[PDB]
Write a protein that binds this DNA or RNA. Structure first.
Ligand SMILES: [K+]
Ligand SMILES: [K+]
Ligand SMILES: [K+]
Ligand SMILES: [K+]
Ligand SMILES: [K+]
Ligand SMILES: [Mg+2]
Ligand SMILES: [Mg+2]
Ligand SMILES: [Mg+2]
Ligand SMILES: [Mg+2]
Ligand SMILES: [Mg+2]
Ligand SMILES: [Mg+2]
Ligand SMILES: [Mg+2]
Ligand SMILES: [Mg+2]
Ligand code: NA
Ligand code: NA
Lengths: 70, 183, 142, 77, 58, 100, 141, 73
RNA sequence: UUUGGUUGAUUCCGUCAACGGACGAGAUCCAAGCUGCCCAGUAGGUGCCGGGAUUGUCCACACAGGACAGCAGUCCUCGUCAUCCUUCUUUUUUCAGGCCCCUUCUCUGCGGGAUUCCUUGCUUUUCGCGCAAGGUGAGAUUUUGGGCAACAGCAGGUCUGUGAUGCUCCUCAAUGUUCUGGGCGACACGCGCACUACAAUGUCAGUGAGAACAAGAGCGACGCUCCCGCUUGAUCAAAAGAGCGGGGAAACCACGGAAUCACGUAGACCCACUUGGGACCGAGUAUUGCAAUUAUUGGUCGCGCAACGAGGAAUGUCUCGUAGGCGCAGCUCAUCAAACUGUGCCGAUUACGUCCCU
């Protein structure tokens, strides 16, 4: 399975809230931003966080999301 | 310029057809030079159907504990078998192999569910034809003056002709007869 | 007169083959010093010769190919040599030729066999204690 | 060039059947290879290296290549 | 003889051991049956039914 | 090849700091150096049964030790070499000087 | 590829033993007690008999030549280390035993050990193993 | 099923059979010949090589262990 | 901390008399597969110069001799500058090498790379969490294998690991300690686990090419003591013995010639308990050790007339470089591996499910 745990999902919501501008729907540019503003150690975790953040931006472009509150 | 490959540089793939339309998509006739590819054919469920048909016959010859893993020896046994087949029938050896495979497995089978009669999928029909022909030849050549390539050639030629002297044909008739008498 | 030369490599299991391709008076292929057409197992000779028959011999017209192989059994070494030659002809057409001919050669190789240009990543699995091999467990008695 | 009797015994080895025990690899006998090198030296096709081992002389290289040209010309009648 | 039919839809695995599968097959004049199949199969496969006077319980 | 300096340690970070700072001293004087060579790293292995008595499922433990080696080549006069390598070494690093 | 003649004999009597005539000469001589595969090849070489013939179609002249070599191997330059019974414990001579002299000599060896009551003689008389093998689970007759 | 009872040397009857009737077959193999004429497989292999030298049959497939012949025609 | 979907997952989404938190799972760590810097007098390569060897107008073409690249002599006039192979030890101007250059291959300390990322179709009314097939790719689902692993327990094992330990027993003709000799193995039988086979998809005898993990030296007898190589023994078996050398291990062994394997070898055998199989037993030899008898081990010739021709009821392990087959190193070790711990080589059939049995 490929379920994202609560540690990944919580961090992605925080990043989108703080850096909504300068994020877009491209994984590769979002990954560079995530590495810049995240302190954690695991590279695998940072890849997953950038992936879920890109997913949220796609959802936001079509309608509001219950947990963001921009 | 590049010409089309010929098996062992002797037999062409130009005019090969499968009369049985049910098994057309599971018998692969892509031209190759030798029955040896070393590919990853078991990664997905239906990927093994794309192995070239002659290589499938080769893979079925290394079965017992003393034969496990000896692919180069099996290629040599197949090479001599094809020459005997061509002399016996005076046709393309690859064509005779295809006809034997298309007529060597039962179409109806019985399963325990009292037993009930069911139908056999095309993939299993191709798999069972190779398995039965190789087993019939291996058992016939044990403790016998005849060599393995002659036993395999006789088994394949009889199966293609539909004769009852083949081990695969006798097994096919008995299984289908039981399924009919069952239900 | 300037020297035209490239160097490529191929791999299979623990075998590494290094091929150097240069412009010569006449085509000549040698593996570990013995010419092709002298490789004793004709099955393995036909496998190595696939790197020439698939594209055609008119592309190997005046090229000398020298191949050195080290590291594994006979079959795995033949698949490494096969890959080194196919990548060598592509490298020799990337430089000293243009893209249209290089693309034509590459697609013929790829539509025949993927492993002519891409290495097979499979390797031996480690053995673990309590097992006779990578996966076979000890016999239980009751 | 420079190979010795121990190196040659590696070349001519085989596997030995030990009865109800697992098989094992066995090297060739060094004494016989010592005899063979002595026969070739008397024919003046072999010689001792300055450092260690054996190597072919100029005559030995010439004889070997002369035989090869015979096979290439199919003079094996 | 035998008649050829084409699998349209796979309905699911049948039996306690899950070695049988139930399919919907169309004959070669627009007649549709439901049959039990042994062996791996997918949509678009062809079967050689010995009789078509028959139906599989669902 | 006048002087060969070989350093070995069980700590990867420690052996890199010693090599880097040794290169610093050589460059600060302007003595020619053949770049550091990373020799193959070795693993020592010991496998033992976990139990002290021999009961239960036969389970094993694997212990490993890694050894790192670095080689630096210097071409400098006699008294210059002692000045270059006079500095103190960190704990757990062994330095040897050899004249080939 | 030569035609079979009338004189071909299916059974060859040699050293009080019936030897099959359909076998090749080295592998037909091995049917005699005291002659193995290695010894049979050396006997044929010293007697001048080609090893690629059958045991039948062997003339009487060749059979007498083979018997002479077997009787006295040392006369035909067979080394001492190639023979059984290399130094007799009773006579100190090197010989080669064949054709039921093997059985007679083996019987004498067993009685010699039993008379002085050596350990190996004792275990032979009891019907047990004599070469240090374990006997808990092996024999099980 | 009893024993094969295969001869090891050629006889007058079997030699003439080999020279006359064998060159008519379509598939010729030492095991096949050893069955039609009750001879050893080793003897049959030598006889077939003799026929090939004479030119009455032609070698089709050759290997160290397997030989396949056919009528020259 | 329930239920509905989903996940290997008390993994997530949603709902909710609960709200906030801790562990475990995941993450972290080690190894493999693709790559960036760095790097070499212990890893390797082209280029010239020198030295050594083969060298063909035509015809000739194995005794029975075929199928498969190159070709300035063909093709339908264009296209070729130049035949190949080796240079180990060794150090020298010849005892055969010398020079100038590079980092594709090797070595590795930090880094990059993969995220259900893209497309299509499904998914409790919608949504959400996700799934399948294809794509991109060295690699496409916990990437592949391991290591670690909560809370509760069991009268499971160990007082034969310890200068771990409570009570208790013996304690100077000792249950302490040492020395000599035996035993731990003894054999009408029952059981677990391995090795070798029952042959031709074979046995024997030759020729050819070809791996990885590793290891190695300071009491008792003036240094030595461990592991190897080259010669010699040799005007005559193996196994020994003896000289001369090398290695503290990317510098020796070593260009690491493993066994399955291959051979158009014009090899031997031909369906039989047979050249299958090697149990049992006799006789001579050398080595380890202070000591070989109850055979330490190796090697030689005999014995092969010991079963065994595929194995009833019952039963073990296993899904991809895996199963099976084949050897090698380490370990125990003065001398002994049919064991275990690792390593590489050849390399498949079947399934991509279910809750019928456990
Ligand atoms: K056990
Ligand atoms: K106690
Ligand atoms: K014991
Ligand atoms: K028991
Ligand atoms: K043990
Ligand atoms: Mg054995
Ligand atoms: Mg074995
Ligand atoms: Mg509760
Ligand atoms: Mg699930
Ligand atoms: Mg034998
Ligand atoms: Mg012996
Ligand atoms: Mg013996
Ligand atoms: Mg026997
Ligand atoms: Na064997
Ligand atoms: Na037992």
């Amino acid at each position: 399975g490929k379920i994202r745990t609560k540690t990944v999902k919580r961090a992605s919501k925080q990043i989108v809230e703080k850096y909504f501008s300068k994020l877009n729907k491209d994984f590769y540019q979002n990954k560079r931003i995530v590495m810049d503003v995240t302190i954690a150690r695991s590279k695998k975790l940072k890849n997953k966080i950038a992936g879920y953040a890109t997913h949220i931006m796609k959802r936001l472009a079509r309608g509001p999301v219950r947990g963001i509150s921009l | 310029s590049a010409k089309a490959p010929k098996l062992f540089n002797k037999w062409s793939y130009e005019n090969l057809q499968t009369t049985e339309i049910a098994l057309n998509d599971y018998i692969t006739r892509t031209p190759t030079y030798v029955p040896h590819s070393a590919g990853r054919w078991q990664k997905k469920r239906f990927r093994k159907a794309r192995i070239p048909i002659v290589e499938r016959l080769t893979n079925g010859l290394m079965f017992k504990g003393r034969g496990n893993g000896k692919k180069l020896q099996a290629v040599r046994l197949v090479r001599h078998t094809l020459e005997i087949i061509h002399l016996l029938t005076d046709q393309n050896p690859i064509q005779v192999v295809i006809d034997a495979v298309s007529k060597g497995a039962p179409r109806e089978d019985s399963t325990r569910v009292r037993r009930q009669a069911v139908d056999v999928s095309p993939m299993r029909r191709v798999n069972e034809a190779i398995y039965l022909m190789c087993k019939g030849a291996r058992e016939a050549a044990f403790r016998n003056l005849k060599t393995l390539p002659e036993c395999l050639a006789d088994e394949i030629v009889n199966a293609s002709k539909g004769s009852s002297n083949s081990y695969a044909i006798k097994k096919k008739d008995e299984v289908e007869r039981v399924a009919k008498a069952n239900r | 007169h300037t020297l035209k030369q490239v160097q490529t490599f191929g791999k299979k299991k623990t075998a590494i083959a290094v091929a150097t391709v240069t412009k010569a008076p006449q085509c000549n292929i040698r593996i570990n010093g013995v010419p092709i057409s002298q490789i004793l197992p004709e099955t393995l000779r036909a496998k190595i010769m696939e790197a020439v028959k698939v594209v055609g011999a008119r592309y190997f017209s005046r090229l000398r190919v020298d191949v050195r192989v080290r590291g594994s059994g006979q079959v795995a070494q033949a698949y490494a040599v096969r890959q080194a030659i196919a990548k060598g002809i592509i490298a020799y057409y990337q430089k000293y030729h243009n893209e249209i001919e290089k693309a034509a050669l590459k697609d013929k190789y790829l539509e025949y066999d993927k492993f002519l240009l891409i290495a097979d990543p499979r390797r031996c699995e480690p053995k673990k204690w309590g097992r006779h091999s990578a996966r076979t467990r000890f016999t239980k008695s009751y | 060039p420079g190979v010795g009797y121990g190196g040659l015994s590696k070349r001519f080895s085989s596997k030995k059947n030990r009865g109800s025990r697992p098989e094992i690899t066995t090297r060739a006998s060094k004494g016989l290879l010592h005899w063979c090198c002595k026969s070739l030296t008397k024919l003046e096709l072999l010689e001792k290296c300055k450092g260690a081992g054996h190597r072919v002389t100029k005559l030995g290289r010439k004889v070997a290549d002369t035989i090869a040209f015979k096979i290439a010309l199919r003079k094996m009648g | 003889q035998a008649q050829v039919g084409v699998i349209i839809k796979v309905l699911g695995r049948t039996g306690s051991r899950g070695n049988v599968t139930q399919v919907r097959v169309r004959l070669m004049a627009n007649r549709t049956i439901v049959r039990n199949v042994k062996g791996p199969c997918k949509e678009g496969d062809m079967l050689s039914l010995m009789e078509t006077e028959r139906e599989a319980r669902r | 090849q006048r002087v060969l300096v070989k350093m070995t340690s069980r700590n990867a970070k420690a052996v890199e700091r010693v090599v880097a700072e040794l290169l610093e001293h050589a460059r600060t004087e302007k003595v020619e150096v053949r770049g550091p060579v990373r020799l193959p790293t070795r693993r020592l292995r010991i496998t033992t049964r976990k139990t002290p008595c021999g009961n239960g499922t036969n389970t094993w433990d694997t212990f490993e030790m890694k050894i790192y080696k670095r080689l630096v080549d210097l071409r400098a006069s006699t008294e210059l070499v002692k000045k270059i390598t006079s500095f103190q070494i960190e704990a757990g690093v062994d330095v040897s000087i050899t004249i080939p | 590829l030569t035609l079979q003649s009338e004189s071909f004999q299916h059974i060859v009597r040699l050293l009080n033993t019936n030897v099959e005539g359909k076998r090749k000469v080295p592998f037909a001589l091995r049917m005699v007690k005291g002659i193995g595969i290695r010894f049979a090849y050396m006997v044929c070489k010293k007697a001048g008999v080609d090893v690629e013939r059958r045991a039948g179609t062997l003339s009487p002249e060749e059979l007498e030549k083979i018997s002479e070599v077997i009787a006295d191997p040392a006369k035909f330059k067979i080394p001492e280390w190639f023979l059984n019974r290399q130094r007799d414990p009773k006579t100190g001579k090197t010989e080669h035993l064949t054709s039921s002299m093997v059985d007679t000599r083996l019987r004498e060896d067993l009685e010699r050990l039993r008379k002085i009551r050596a350990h190996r003689g004792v275990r032979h008389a009891y019907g047990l193993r004599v070469r240090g093998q374990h006997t808990c689970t092996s024999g099980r007759r | 099923r009893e024993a094969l009872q295969n001869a090891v040397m050629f006889d007058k009857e079997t030699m003439d059979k080999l020279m006359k009737e064998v060159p008519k077959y379509k598939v010729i193999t030492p095991s096949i010949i050893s069955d039609r004429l009750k001879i050893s497989v080793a003897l049959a292999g030598k006889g077939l090589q003799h026929l090939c030298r004479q030119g009455l049959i032609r070698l089709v497939s050759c290997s160290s262990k397997f030989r396949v012949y056919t009528r020259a025609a």
